[PDB]
Ligand binder design. Sequence first.
Ligand SMILES: C[C@@](F)(P(=O)(O)O)P(=O)(O)OP(=O)(O)OC[C@H]1O[C@@H](n2cnc3c(=O)[nH]c(N)nc32)C[C@@H]1O
Ligand SMILES: [Cl-]
Ligand SMILES: [Cl-]
Ligand SMILES: [Cl-]
Ligand SMILES: [Mg+2]
Ligand code: NA
Ligand code: NA
Ligand code: NA
Length: 326
Amino acid sequence: TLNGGITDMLTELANFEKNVSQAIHKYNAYRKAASVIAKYPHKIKSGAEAKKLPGVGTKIAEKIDEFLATGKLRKLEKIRQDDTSSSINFLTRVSGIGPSAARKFVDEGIKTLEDLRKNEDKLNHHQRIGLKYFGDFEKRIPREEMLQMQDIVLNEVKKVDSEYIATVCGSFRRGAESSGDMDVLLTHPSFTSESTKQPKLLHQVVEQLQKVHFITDTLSKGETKFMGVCQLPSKNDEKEYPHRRIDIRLIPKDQYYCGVLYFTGSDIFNKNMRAHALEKGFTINEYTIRPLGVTGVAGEPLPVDSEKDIFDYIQWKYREPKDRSE
DNA sequence: GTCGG
DNA sequence: GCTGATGCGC
DNA sequence: CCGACCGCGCATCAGC
Ligand SMILES: C[C@@](F)(P(=O)(O)O)P(=O)(O)OP(=O)(O)OC[C@H]1O[C@@H](n2cnc3c(=O)[nH]c(N)nc32)C[C@@H]1O
Ligand SMILES: [Cl-]
Ligand SMILES: [Cl-]
Ligand SMILES: [Cl-]
Ligand SMILES: [Mg+2]
Ligand code: NA
Ligand code: NA
Ligand code: NA
């Protein structure tokens, strides 16, 4: 929060470009600037000082100067007053509704929470659940609750098959005191990059979690990725907990390290690391790290026995999960 | 919007 | 039905 | 300048 004012401004600009302008690269440009500045150990005194940081160019340096001088940004001020921009931005807050769907709904005159509710007939499944838990999904999850959720998930998975290994990733693994949702990496010995010896490996787990009333809704579900909703059980007479977003990713057991690296993030950390990888002649995904041939085509997966090996390949000193919150 | 070749 | 492009969220 | 901007699972749709 040393430069919270500036980072908030840049984040609002990023969201505008993504949601309204549908300019993904501008969105990322702003996110990166925000990220590099949030990391800066000094209270920024000027745009010039900020421009010294990679990702902060002339345009953002000018904005920072305006913000520092007046405490606000006219460009944003105008965006906030724009009804269409505001409506589109709002709708995209519903899980399942992106920049395209938001603009379309706005064209059809659907611009508010009240509108969405009286038009649930025009929403797909995911959007319908996002609307249902709109408020809850806005709430953060105290680490204390994440621990209870972890306890439930691991024990229930154990009951299904003792050979399953569930690992909570996301900001939780990065040591955050609160998280926006729960991300679970799952592995089973029967499923490797070599073969799938048992079907419904993910299904069984999802089924067991619904059975004990932990998982309450499903946004989408495939053979390797589950995206849904869960809720901690409450005690007698006590107000029940808010519903929470939960993602479960089944990854080949032999590709655990690339998988946990990916699911631990952050998202910007992953983007920066994958981009650095390319520069170094490698490509990284949640499964492997492969070298790039003379032409630029990915080669065969390189041997990996720890997260550190991945860092070593691209000549990066190792960084503990807690230092990957970019 | 920002960067390196 | 399929393949491929797109939206969306990660 | 001017191309590059991470990489991918699932839902949905068009076109066949
Ligand atoms: C935002 C959080 F801090 P919280 O959920 O606690 O509020 P976190 O859990 O970190 O993110 P979230 O749950 O959206 O996605 C989980 C991981 O997926 C990976 N991931 C997400 N988005 C991307 C992306 O665009 N690219 C890549 N490569 N990985 C991504 C890295 C992410 O860490
Ligand atoms: Cl763009
Ligand atoms: Cl691995
Ligand atoms: Cl791969
Ligand atoms: Mg998360
Ligand atoms: Na700069
Ligand atoms: Na959304
Ligand atoms: Na998530």
